[PDB]
Amino acid sequence: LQFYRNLGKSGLRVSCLGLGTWVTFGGQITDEMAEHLMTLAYDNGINLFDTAEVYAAGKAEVVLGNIIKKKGWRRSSLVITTKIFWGGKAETERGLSRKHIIEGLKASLERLQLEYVDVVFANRPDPNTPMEETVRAMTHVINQGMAMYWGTSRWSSMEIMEAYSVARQFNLIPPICEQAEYHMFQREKVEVQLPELFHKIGVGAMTWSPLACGIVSGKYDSGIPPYSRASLKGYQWLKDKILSEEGRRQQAKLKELQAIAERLGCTLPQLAIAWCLRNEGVSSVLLGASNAEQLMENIGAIQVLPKLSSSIVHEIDSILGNKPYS
Amino acid sequence: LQFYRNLGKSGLRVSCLGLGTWVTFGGQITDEMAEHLMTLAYDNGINLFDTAEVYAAGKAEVVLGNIIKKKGWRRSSLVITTKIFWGGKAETERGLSRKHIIEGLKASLERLQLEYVDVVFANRPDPNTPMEETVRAMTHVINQGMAMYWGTSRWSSMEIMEAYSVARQFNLIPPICEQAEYHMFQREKVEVQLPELFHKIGVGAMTWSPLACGIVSGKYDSGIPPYSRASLKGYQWLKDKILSEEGRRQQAKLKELQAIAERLGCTLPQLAIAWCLRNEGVSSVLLGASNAEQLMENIGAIQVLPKLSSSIVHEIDSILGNKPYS
Amino acid sequence: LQFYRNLGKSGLRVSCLGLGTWVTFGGQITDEMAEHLMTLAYDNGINLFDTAEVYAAGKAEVVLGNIIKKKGWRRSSLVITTKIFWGGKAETERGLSRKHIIEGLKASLERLQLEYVDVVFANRPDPNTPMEETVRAMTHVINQGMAMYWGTSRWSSMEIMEAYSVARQFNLIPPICEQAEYHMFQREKVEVQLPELFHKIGVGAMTWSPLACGIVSGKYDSGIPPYSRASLKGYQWLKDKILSEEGRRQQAKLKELQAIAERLGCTLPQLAIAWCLRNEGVSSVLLGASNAEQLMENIGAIQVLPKLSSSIVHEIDSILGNKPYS
Amino acid sequence: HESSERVVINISGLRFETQLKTLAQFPETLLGDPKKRMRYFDPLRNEYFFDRNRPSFDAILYYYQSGGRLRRPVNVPLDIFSEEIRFYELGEEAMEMFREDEGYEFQRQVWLLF
């Protein structure tokens, strides 16, 4: 119902849908296509756009940076996020040390051609860097004007809470967001771990991959279509899990979920995305698209969100049978 | 008696009268008139000048910025304030989040052509942004050299006290001022709520609209004069309250207050302004004027302030009958 | 076994070997030789490079700064350290005051042609400057972006712990490293004093002079070879200790240690360097070299480190007879 | 959940500090159940606040630290300390031990008079 919503218990207002740049920007799709995909999202009210320094070895932030500069959109009207962890072959170019957090974020801002990102994420937990060093570094870049907020990604709820403690301990800035994978076949974290942190310390969730890299779309019940993500170089790992034992088992359950999509007058990608936004602890879902027909179809998941009854939600939890034990 | 006075319990010395820019600058009056009005106020000892990013959609700060640059006045001799809340159509361009407080104040400084404002206000309370985020953002812009002090506007005394708590909690900078409406027909806040905060935490009051947008001047007992504020586009709301049931009731009470003005050898606008400065908790009153004859008349309220006896103050509280129950 | 290792309990990853610039850069060896020595170290995985404002009266940081600029190495791939204490003849140009820490580090960054060093050290304890002033100054340059971390050098464990206390006392940044002399003839500090701080507050040790300025290499059992360090101007102090009473006594013990080198299929410099890295509290050993044959020989000490058995370690502690009483 | 994570409990200004594994020992109590105690959490200070009696909480926290020892302090009234045990919801099996340690138709009608 309500389109925009706060990113956790903070003042940053993001749209419930966001456009990511993994795989697509600077790799799968042309720059002319990326501009068209972003202009559609921006003209439809989406303000949240996600990227990382590891996507396309920096070419994704470059493509994203040129679209923003070309279209001339107001920086105040955009919510740009970036993730820092993998920044080069060298030893000191990876992790969450104060050296790479500052160097990596500065390098991303150069490619993005932006003075600051709205949120800077830790793309994964770094067991080599002490929590105090990471929190001080994240607070430092915020106070230096390179970022407005900072969040975590792939951190356990025990680690997110620790960063909140170290922040309160040394009068620093706690994290406000957590990027966790969340779709119909990955539910243990957002539905069990995170909601306790959303009510306790107010950390919101910005979930990624709502269609399991396109698996939920049902385009794989026959095989691996050409030009799809599974057919791409570097994504043999995805093709393995699709044609594996569990892969065919998931495709069978999508056939039943398809009937729920037709009954609700929508597609299956729209049902899966609307299924993610059904939680109050989910501040936004990051979409992915390689063509304009996919994007504006996935934007239509907002229509399906009111049509989600607890009877339907219970109906889907029976087809999947993966309801996490609370 | 004493012209200049401290802004609350702080070291910033403001004149008891200040010139605002709502309605007039960049809208009702020409830029050549605005320059003349400001030069009169500055040449008469007024150092406090008020504006906001919402007035004339940014044109008020532009006009104000050009007068200061043209006349070549010493920045050290001016006290420039600005208010931040409404900054554009977009979702992330409104409120008191760290994103808009920094972006909105930076944009105001660009239009003002100034490196910093002396005070930055929160034009209204923002129920979407946590208090800790707003206080950190206000402290951040102060430590970054974009502002000297920060205050609140339209906040309840419970919210102002909370910002003071969160400031002391995280070793941040508390607010020093509160802009509240205060005239003969709006008295519940400055005369009851605020004086407790002025003695406890020393938050001063910088009251606005001392003549109820010109109603107290008595120019409406016949009708809506041409070229006045009530006849302006976008101010039908004011014309409604003037010709309403209470509107004629207020005009009747001004007839009695007029006799007090003649008895004191002054006008009615001067009596109403001097009536506001009668409190120690009121650090300054923000004036408004569309011509030079109004301004230098309103400046004459300083003469009426010594002539205010407690017998006269009690006499006015009987005509209004709105003495707030302490 | 494991090449790179954390600098103490911090996130900065340094190689176990580092190339220093004392004596050599800007003094003993030509700039063309210094470039060749550094390119060999960098091409072999060494990222840690050490210098000071006192080495060659600033010419060492200049030579080091030109190599980094010429080769075009990524700043994110380098770990540059500098030490601040001796900065000129004047009275205010020495010590650990806030004046010289800021002025001295700024001057080093100018010669280094770098925006920041990864670590800034206090080259020696300053009994004239209060600990609170030094810690605030070290925290200040870190927060100003002139340095990433700061450490101590030649400080006693009682002083290092005090800096950690004053840091926790005033919410500042504690030190992460300590540069202490450590070779087969100087062992009381790294083997007794420091390991308590490495487990308590996690301060790592970056040891310097692993060959006693070349004494351990065994090139002095006949006399003072030409072009060596002992034959250099300004190093009569070294020539005195070599030909002194204890000097010949140390050369006699090197003859026995030579047999251990041949038994392990390595040289004596390699055995002494690998002997230093045998402690977990030693984060890195700073090498020194005047020719390329010395450097790539000393780099081979990594091969000897696995071949160090506790039987061999006990065998060397018997030849030296200087095992520090724990 | 038994994880050495530290928990700060503030009793009317008196600061208490313990491990989460200590409170998770008794999940049926107030401080032991994450759902019951979250109503008292302060995200600005990372602590749980209670506006209640201060001398009583010494034994309440030690009831978790010792593993079941519930002994009223010598300076806390008996009626006050007993009302604190019911707030923190230590349990009837624990309340009974505290009382033991403290020293504590026609047929039915004719049966009453006699």
Ligand SMILES: NC(=O)c1ccc[n+]([C@@H]2O[C@H](COP(=O)([O-])OP(=O)(O)OC[C@H]3O[C@@H](n4cnc5c(N)ncnc54)[C@H](OP(=O)(O)O)[C@@H]3O)[C@@H](O)[C@H]2O)c1
């Ligand atoms: N925090 C992290 O570590 C992390 C990790 C991953 C992603 N992310 C962020 O989250 C975003 C999520 O991306 P995602 O790839 O996971 O998105 P997704 O929704 O899981 O899948 C997107 C992909 O599925 C296919 N697809 C999308 N819409 C479709 C439709 N309507 N019909 C049929 N196929 C469709 C497209 O692939 P093809 O057309 O190529 O088949 C598209 O590239 C990323 O862009 C990134 O910003 C974050």
Ligand SMILES: NC(=O)c1ccc[n+]([C@@H]2O[C@H](COP(=O)([O-])OP(=O)(O)OC[C@H]3O[C@@H](n4cnc5c(N)ncnc54)[C@H](OP(=O)(O)O)[C@@H]3O)[C@@H](O)[C@H]2O)c1
């Ligand atoms: N914090 C806030 O939210 C807030 C809100 C409002 C204002 N403010 C600040 O406070 C200032 C107060 O402005 P205000 O409009 O409330 O001032 P006001 O004193 O209430 O009324 C000023 C208006 O009354 C008329 N007027 C002024 N002097 C007169 C005189 N001597 N005789 C007859 N008519 C006279 C003029 O209007 P016409 O000539 O057009 O009739 C003038 O524009 C603003 O400039 C703004 O800076 C702040």
Ligand SMILES: NC(=O)c1ccc[n+]([C@@H]2O[C@H](COP(=O)([O-])OP(=O)(O)OC[C@H]3O[C@@H](n4cnc5c(N)ncnc54)[C@H](OP(=O)(O)O)[C@@H]3O)[C@@H](O)[C@H]2O)c1
């Ligand atoms: N914190 C401090 O106060 C402090 C003090 C000193 C040094 N340091 C740092 O630590 C580094 C240590 O330098 P160091 O001079 O002590 O190094 P070292 O290992 O003690 O000796 C290096 C010197 O020994 C000779 N040498 C080196 N390798 C050799 C080999 N394989 N065979 C024969 N001779 C060899 C060379 O001198 P010749 O060829 O000239 O004989 C070379 O200059 C310095 O560069 C400096 O960065 C710090």
